[PDB]
Amino acid sequence: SLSSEALMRRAVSLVTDSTSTFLSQTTYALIEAITEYTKAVYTLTSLYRQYTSLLGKMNSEEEDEVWQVIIGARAEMTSKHQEYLKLETTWMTAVGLSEMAAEAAYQTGADQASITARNHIQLVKLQVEEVHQLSRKAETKLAEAQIEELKQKTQEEGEERAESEQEAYLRED
Amino acid sequence: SLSSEALMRRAVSLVTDSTSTFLSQTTYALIEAITEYTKAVYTLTSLYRQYTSLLGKMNSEEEDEVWQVIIGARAEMTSKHQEYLKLETTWMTAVGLSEMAAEAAYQTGADQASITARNHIQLVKLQVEEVHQLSRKAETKLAEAQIEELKQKTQEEGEERAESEQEAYLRED
């Protein structure tokens, strides 16, 4: 049936159109969310570096103020991470919708509109993978800073503790 | 009551002992799992590099065999990732147990055993953070390889598609 297949092609082109738009929308929203998250990681990173540069103790005021800000910054980082996870889920659904739309286009003979859709899905994936990689690069810098901070803190801890133990040893031991 | 506090100290020292051991055990198991995961990411990384070096098509046999192996390698990577997530959860509980054990030790006056426990928890955390960072470093290499592969594939896709469109244009358009 010539007219039946024409109708199936038309119906699928309506699905492709609506799904492509939803994918574009969710893609940009997701990229925006990851970028907001990445900024928050960079912010938290410099704070750890500041705290570490003050370690040993000495300036007990700055040290505690910086640590207080870190607590709040961890919080902001966490909310922005959950926000992007939420959009990531929606984005995956959007990707599935488009892929199934491309498959449907294929099954009904709209091979053209199928390849086209398949290619746009690809570019959207590459795009998301790249902003994701930038975020991961930021996470690596944050982790290194957290590690250095723990390195220093545990070190200062051991030294202050060896001291107290040595002083306790001299108090008759 | 001198004897009451002695008993509370003894009871807490039993908790500290058992919790420290559980933490050490889960820590090593978790580190082992992350390392197994990291190896799997490195393996998948070189496979992507091989596939990308074959791109454009030409050797359609090697290309598809390599892609077939990748499918299986993604699977192995995924199972080892879920395995480490499972141990990560158990590990977090172990960390919570030890921290609460340190708090209890403090509340009952076992200040010594408290600081001690607090310091071991710290080192265990630093340790886990470092193997985690190695894994993240591997993930970064894998992501870059996946990105390059997508870069190339989308490029070859566009070129083969422009060709088919141009050839279709000449078939009278």
Side-chain angles (χ1 to χ4, degrees):
Chain A
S1 172
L2 242 300
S3 57
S4 291
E5 53 178 87
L7 252 56
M8 283 186 271
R9 282 180 259 126
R10 174 56 82 77
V12 173
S13 70
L14 295 175
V15 174
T16 289
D17 178 57
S18 69
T19 53
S20 284
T21 298
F22 185 47
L23 177 63
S24 288
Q25 196 193 65
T26 304
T27 293
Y28 193 75
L30 172 58
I31 287 183
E32 212 159 49
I34 296 179
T35 299
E36 231 90 60
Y37 169 68
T38 295
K39 165 233 62 204
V41 166
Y42 274 132
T43 295
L44 184 59
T45 300
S46 49
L47 282 46
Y48 267 90
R49 280 169 172 167
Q50 287 180 176
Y51 182 78
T52 291
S53 66
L54 307 181
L55 278 182
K57 282 187 174 182
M58 47 219 80
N59 297 303
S60 189
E61 69 159 303
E62 264 291 290
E63 205 165 71
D64 292 306
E65 293 296 285
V66 172
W67 189 263
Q68 183 56 58
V69 177
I70 281 188
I71 300 300
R74 280 178 182 166
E76 181 200 1
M77 167 183 72
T78 284
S79 82
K80 308 196 79 56
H81 183 66
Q82 296 184 303
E83 169 76 294
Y84 117 67
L85 286 185
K86 169 58 179 177
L87 285 188
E88 163 119 298
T89 292
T90 304
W91 180 73
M92 297 187 290
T93 299
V95 173
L97 281 167
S98 278
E99 300 175 318
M100 298 177 84
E103 180 60 54
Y106 177 71
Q107 303 172 338
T108 61
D111 274 291
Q112 324 83 48
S114 187
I115 294 178
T116 294
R118 191 279 260 78
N119 284 180
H120 173 254
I121 286 171
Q122 297 281 62
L123 282 299
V124 169
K125 286 158 65 172
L126 176 65
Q127 194 169 45
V128 167
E129 270 182 299
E130 303 178 316
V131 304
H132 220 292
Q133 175 77 148
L134 263 41
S135 188
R136 180 156 40 248
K137 204 280 174 60
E139 285 174 341
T140 295
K141 293 178 177 297
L142 171 61
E144 175 53 16
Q146 290 174 150
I147 288 172
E148 280 295 353
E149 185 279 316
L150 238 202
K151 228 91 165 256
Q152 302 289 67
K153 191 179 174 188
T154 60
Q155 170 201 172
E156 315 300 346
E157 255 156 51
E159 306 183 342
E160 302 178 308
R161 217 276 187 135
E163 263 182 294
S164 312
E165 248 49 55
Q166 289 161 4
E167 293 177 302
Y169 180 71
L170 290 177
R171 275 177 277 156
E172 269 307 292
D173 269 59
Chain B
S1 172
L2 242 300
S3 57
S4 291
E5 53 178 87
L7 252 56
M8 283 186 271
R9 282 180 259 126
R10 174 56 82 77
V12 173
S13 70
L14 295 175
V15 174
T16 289
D17 178 57
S18 69
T19 53
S20 284
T21 298
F22 185 47
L23 177 63
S24 288
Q25 196 193 65
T26 304
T27 293
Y28 193 75
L30 172 58
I31 287 183
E32 212 159 49
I34 296 179
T35 299
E36 231 90 60
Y37 169 68
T38 295
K39 165 233 62 204
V41 166
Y42 274 132
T43 295
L44 184 59
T45 300
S46 49
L47 282 46
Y48 267 90
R49 280 169 172 167
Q50 287 180 176
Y51 182 78
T52 291
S53 66
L54 307 181
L55 278 182
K57 282 187 174 182
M58 47 219 80
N59 297 303
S60 189
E61 69 159 303
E62 264 291 290
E63 205 165 71
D64 292 306
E65 293 296 285
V66 172
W67 189 263
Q68 183 56 58
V69 177
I70 281 188
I71 300 300
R74 280 178 182 166
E76 181 200 1
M77 167 183 72
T78 284
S79 82
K80 308 196 79 56
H81 183 66
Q82 296 184 303
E83 169 76 294
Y84 117 67
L85 286 185
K86 169 58 179 177
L87 285 188
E88 163 120 298
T89 292
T90 304
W91 180 73
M92 297 187 290
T93 299
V95 173
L97 281 167
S98 278
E99 300 175 318
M100 298 177 84
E103 180 60 54
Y106 177 71
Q107 303 172 338
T108 61
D111 274 291
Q112 324 83 48
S114 187
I115 294 178
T116 294
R118 191 279 260 78
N119 284 180
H120 173 254
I121 286 171
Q122 297 281 62
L123 282 299
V124 169
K125 286 158 65 172
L126 176 65
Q127 194 169 45
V128 167
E129 270 182 299
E130 303 178 316
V131 304
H132 220 292
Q133 175 77 148
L134 263 41
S135 188
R136 180 156 40 248
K137 204 280 174 60
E139 285 174 341
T140 295
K141 293 178 177 297
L142 171 61
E144 175 53 16
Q146 290 174 150
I147 288 172
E148 280 295 353
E149 185 279 316
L150 238 202
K151 228 92 165 256
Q152 302 289 67
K153 191 179 174 188
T154 60
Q155 170 201 172
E156 315 300 346
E157 255 156 51
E159 306 183 342
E160 302 178 308
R161 217 276 187 135
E163 263 182 294
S164 312
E165 248 49 55
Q166 289 161 4
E167 293 177 302
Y169 180 71
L170 290 177
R171 275 177 277 156
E172 269 307 292
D173 269 59

